[PDB]
Amino acid sequence: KISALDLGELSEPTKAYFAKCEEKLGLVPNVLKAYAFDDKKLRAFTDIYNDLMLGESGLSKLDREMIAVAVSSINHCYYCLTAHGAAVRQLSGDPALGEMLVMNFRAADLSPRQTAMLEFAVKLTEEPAKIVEADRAALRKAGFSDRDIWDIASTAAFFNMSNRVAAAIDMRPNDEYHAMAR
Amino acid sequence: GKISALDLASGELSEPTKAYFAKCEEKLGLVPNVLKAYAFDDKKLRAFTDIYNDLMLGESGLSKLDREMIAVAVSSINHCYYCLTAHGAAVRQLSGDPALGEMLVMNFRAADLSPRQTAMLEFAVKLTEEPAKIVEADRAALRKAGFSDRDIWDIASTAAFFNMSNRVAAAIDMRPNDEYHAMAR
Amino acid sequence: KISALDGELSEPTKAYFAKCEEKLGLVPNVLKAYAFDDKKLRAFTDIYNDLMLGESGLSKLDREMIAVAVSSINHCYYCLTAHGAAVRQLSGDPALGEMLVMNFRAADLSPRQTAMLEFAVKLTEEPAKIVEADRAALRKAGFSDRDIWDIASTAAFFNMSNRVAAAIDMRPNDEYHAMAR
Amino acid sequence: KISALDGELSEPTKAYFAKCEEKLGLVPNVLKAYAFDDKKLRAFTDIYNDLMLGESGLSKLDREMIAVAVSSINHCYYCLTAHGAAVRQLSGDPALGEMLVMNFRAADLSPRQTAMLEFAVKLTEEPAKIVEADRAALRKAGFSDRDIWDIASTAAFFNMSNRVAAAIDMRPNDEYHAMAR
Amino acid sequence: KISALGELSEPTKAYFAKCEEKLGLVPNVLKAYAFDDKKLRAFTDIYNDLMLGESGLSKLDREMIAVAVSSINHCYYCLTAHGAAVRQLSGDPALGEMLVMNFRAADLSPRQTAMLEFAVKLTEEPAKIVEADRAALRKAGFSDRDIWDIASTAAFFNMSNRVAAAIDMRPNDEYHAMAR
Amino acid sequence: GKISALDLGELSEPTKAYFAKCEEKLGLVPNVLKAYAFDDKKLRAFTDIYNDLMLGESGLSKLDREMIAVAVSSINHCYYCLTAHGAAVRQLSGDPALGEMLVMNFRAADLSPRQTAMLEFAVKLTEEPAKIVEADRAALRKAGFSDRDIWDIASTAAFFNMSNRVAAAIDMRPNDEYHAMAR
Q1: Which of E127, E152, E156 sits opposite F77 (nearest CB)?
Q2: Do B135 and F105 touch (CB under 8 A)?
Q3: In this structure, are C64 and C134 located in the same domain?
Q4: Which of B29, C130, D47, E46 has the fewest Cβ atoms surrounding its Cβ within 10 A?
Q5: How far apart are CA D37 and CA D62, in angstroms?
Q6: DSSP per-residue letters across B45-57
Q7: How many independent structural domains does chain B possess?
């Protein structure tokens, strides 16, 4: 079961893409399978995911994965802590960093720059109503540009969406994730 | 004047974006400020409009008004000025009922909603406040209200998207168009 | 229906409503809810009028702003409608009403206004946790101790109003929605 | 000090305090805090006496119990002290005062008293979420619509009292601590 | 009914004889563990060492932490029992009341304030403790061992509150009238 | 390679002997035992309570109890305990995935009705212990737990509410060995 919801054969272009996934990764990420009932939806998801997590940014790819895990920790999202926790381990080379981010980032002995980024993602996840100029000013003082700030917010905001889709439908992450990068 | 509290530079709009905005303006009589926020990268703008349109306007077992109701209920919980303004105006427009618009912004429990609409909005509230605690009984209750698994998917997506949207606007102090306020009163 | 709960009005109350209808273009629905007991109606109108229209270091708009911000946290349909109308009216600024109903942090308020609303928010959300630095912060913003009293009382009062309205499902007048847009 | 906030009492206020002293053994400090404006003092005592002492399908103990349960959620030192002593005095059971102050769920109340308190808790913690089902639970426990009003009103009022007290750090009289032990 | 969930051993009978003579009652919490003498011993040892052992915190400091924590958690048993201890140790019936109710009304020193504010945050939001929180305790006049002792006292009452809560453990009637 | 953020020395010979028995049985000395080793009386009292509760006779299996520990630790975001007891769930279940699920969100795990009722009670005792009523015990009994089970469930949940708070307060650090174990 990739989820608790019941939704056709895959379209030719999704089979093409999934082939690519299986060639590059060992596997087709289950989130893509969840979306595959509707190619418009699949394509719009992959378009945003890739721009946000892989696009050009002052944040590294690992920065963004660390934001994704921090937010997914607060929300207790099993799919995302699994998939993106594997990504932190893999991108960092540090199996322990992935566990700490999954459990409590305050445990991690992060740099000031990384702390500031994650503390903002925390407030944005927990109490969006309360974000004020002082919260932006804290990121600037940490050395982030305003476009960096856009990218931190966008990433944190995105995972607030991803967590809730996954929770809503009980989406299951690939079993291969668990053993990777340990 | 500023559409957000970030201090962004920007170059010219691409000719495709100028055209696209010419049509927003021709149609809606405004270019929604969120679109202007994403115009620094046509890549992002296209991503945004694709997801928004499929979500809010594509085929669904949810009417367009149901989805604007989910948008506003979620935005009410998170106290999102951008979204309450913009989707509040959409609810008043689509229903033809300015008071309904106001109830959803303030407290949807004050509106005389069908059991179906209540079940939908109560799921959205739980997904907004405590996504860790969603269980099969939550989905079971939507099914008792008549929703298909594809509908549950659309409710969850709509509610999810607004949790993202509210956070992007909150994080950067995004400013809704002044014109929304007076519409459909 | 003015509420979810179930004879004739008194002559004093029938005449009180004649006047409201003259001065305002309507009888506020809260007055009709209390109308089953004139003792209770008089008590309410006495506290309401002293708090909102009486003497204070706060302007009447300052107090309507506090009312809306508290009602916003509590999601009170009656009070957001009624006092939102009042902010639109007193300020001449339809957008300001909406900001206060939705999120006051979007509004471009003075430091004094901001200080006043942040206190009303803490008193609404965690009154257990008020400490002397909450009072010290009002003083820095320039509030006397009597202004602090008035802010506290205005905020406390809509914590009661929000809860009566919510309990009984009290309905605001339709005309409020169209007003001052 | 009776609060953390900074002339003479009026003649009628001095006479009223002399009478309190005789009838109660003390002048309630809340009355002293209001004594800077007799209008406000009056408004306070009118609403208080009507709510707490006026005719209702709720006993006087029922209403003090609501008061203390609200104050306990809000951690109001003034009200837990003053109304806790009221519960102890009216019930003649010091243990019951304690339970209500600490956690009413330990008390072993009737199904009626538990229905009433569960509604006051919800109204206190999440007024945004009150629905018809909540009023329907009161009816099923035997309350008339007018009791529902009185229950709501009592709980609403103490959400205002708790906040005025907390905002200004209002201090209860020392004598309450030893009362009815 | 000490709770909402028989024969005592001879030692446990002896031990209850000394509490009786020393305290004027047998704390109900002891009666609730006395179905197993080794769980009773385990409890008494940890309890005694915690509240009565050598520490840079006073016995009263520790009893105040117990009450502030119990107040946040609304624990009838521990508010009653440790409220009594605070009244008795301090000599001040009002102080016990203030901590049961709201310690911010209490007029404590900056050192006592820092202590209870840390115990509060640990009770409410243990996920968010940080070095700045420990640096604020040092600033208020606490050692590293005093931080361990505060944390352990606060942590223990977070367990006690939850066992009492879970089984509806009832405090002794006699606590209520004491040191008033 | 610090066991905590506090200024915490020279172990007694009995304590060193016990730690060798730890290496022999566990492959490591739990850092929690090192934290307590400044005083053997405290170390002794901790080991006594811990072992009775986690290993002593009980209607709950050892795994049942490690699951209550991880579920509580998950709510409180306790890095020490999620690490140490996450590893114990993986080791006792032989199912790496189950350890992850309980650390992340137990509602994802394919638990029996009975197991779910247990964790649901652990959750409420963790989040809102003021609100525990007879109806919460009744639901455990409907799930088929005895009252001695209810007590053990409550004691286990309670205990980790303390353990998490001591760990968080002093920044106690779990052994790096835990992270690779039973994967």
Answers
A1: E127
A2: no
A3: yes
A4: B29
A5: 31
A6: HHHHHHHHHHHHH
A7: 2
Containing F96, the helix (H) or strand (E) segment is helix F96-105
DSSP label at E74? T
CA distance B165 to B180: 18
Give the C:D interface size as CB pairs under 8 Å.
121
Last residue of a domain, one of A41, A58, A75: A58
| Rounded Cα gap, residues A118 and A114, in angstroms | 6
Nearest-CA distance E56 → chain C (Å): 27
Method: X-ray
Is-contact A118 A66, C-beta < 8 A?
Answer: yes
- D178 to E93: CB separation less than 8 angstroms, yes or no: yes
| C107 and C163 housed in the same domain | yes
Residues 6+ apart with CB under 8 A from D2: D29, D32, D33, D170, D171
Reported resolution in A? 2.0
Specify the CATH number for the domain of residue A105.
1.20.1290.10
F182 and chain A: CB distance < 8 Å anywhere?
no
Spatial separation of the C-alpha atoms in residues B141 and D124, rounded to whole Å: 27
Q: What gap in Å lies between CA A175 and CA D75, rounded to an integer?
A: 48
Between E and F, how many residue pairs show a Cβ–Cβ distance under 8 A?
Answer: 113
Whether residue E130 and residue A104 make contact (CB cut-off 8 A), yes or no, is no
F70 & F55 share domain: no
Question: Nearest residue on chain C to D149, judged by CA atoms?
Answer: C168
- Token match 């300052």: residue? C62
**Amino acid (1-letter code) at residue F58:** S
Q: Chain A residues with CB inside 8 Å of E130's CB?
A: 106
CA distance E103 to chain C (A): 10
Q: C-alpha distances in angstroms, C76 versus C72, C81, C159?
A: 7, 8, 10
Per the CB < 8 A criterion, the answer to whether A60 and A152 are in contact is no
D105 contact F CB<8A: yes
Tell me, yes or no, whether B7 lies in a domain.
no
Q: Residues C70, C112: one domain? A: yes
F44 and F99 belong to one structural domain: no
F vs C contact (3+ beta-carbon pairs below 8 A): no
Identify whether B124 is part of a domain.
yes
Residues F138 and F54 in one domain: no
Q: Do chains E and C touch (3 or more CB pairs under 8 A)?
A: yes
Nearest to F43 by CA among F6, F11, F70, F2: F11
Pair (F83, F38) in one structural domain: no
Closest residue by Cα to residue B5 from B178, B175, B173, B177: B173
Question: E90 vs chain F: nearest CA distance in angstroms?
Answer: 27
Q: How many residues does chain C have?
A: 181
Our separate counts of H helices and E strands in chain D read: 9, 0
Residue A2, domain member (yes or no)? no
Contacts of E91 (CB under 8 A, 6+ apart): none
Do the domain assignments include residue C1?
no
Question: Is A129 part of the contact surface with chain C (CB cutoff 8 Å)?
Answer: yes
| Interface residue B76 vs chain C (CB under 8 A) | yes
Same domain, yes or no: E88 and E153: yes
Q: Give the tokens for residue F152.
A: 């053990």
- Please tell me the distance from the alpha carbon of residue C15 to that of residue C22, in angstroms, as a whole number: 11
Using a CB-CB cut-off of 8 Å, the residues of chain B touching D129 are 109
Q: Write out the residue range of the structural domain in which residue E42 sits.
A: 7-56
CA pair distance A67, A119, nearest whole angstrom: 10
d(CA E105, CA E116): 12
B–F touching, 3+ CB–CB pairs within 8 Å: yes
CATH no. for residue F44? Answer: 1.20.5.810
- The closest alpha carbon to A164, from B157, B171, B71, B148, belongs to B157
Q: Select from C128, C156, C157 the Cβ nearest to the Cβ of D75.
A: C128
Best probe of the F interface among E138, E158, E168, E170, by most F CBs < 10 A, is E158
Which residue bears the tokens 């049985």?
A: F25
